[PDB]
C-alpha cells in the first residue's frame, strides 16, 4: 500500500523515505541526515527525537 504523506520537519522534503525516521512519541518525521547529531542508519527498536526522549 501507499506511504503516508509525511515530510521531514527539518528540510520539508518527503524524499528518501527509507531514511525518514518517525518519532515514537510526537510522530514527526526527521531524515537521518537532517538530525543533529547525524544518524548513520535506522536505529533498532523504538526511537525518540530530541524533544521526546525525556
Amino acid at each position: 500500500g501507499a506511504m503516508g504523506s509525511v515530510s521531514c520537519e527539518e528540510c520539508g522534503g518527503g524524499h528518501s523515505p527509507s531514511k525518514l525516521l518517525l518519532c515514537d512519541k510526537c510522530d514527526r518525521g526527521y531524515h537521518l541526515f537532517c538530525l543533529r547529531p547525524i544518524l548513520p542508519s535506522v536505529p533498532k527498536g523504538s526511537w525518540f527525537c530530541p524533544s521526546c526522549s525525556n
Binding site: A2, M3, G4, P17, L20, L22, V42
Partner: peptide, 11 residues
Amino acid sequence: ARTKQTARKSY
C-alpha cells in the same frame, strides 16, 4: 524504528 518507507499497509 519506524520510517516513512515502513509506514504503509502491505496486504
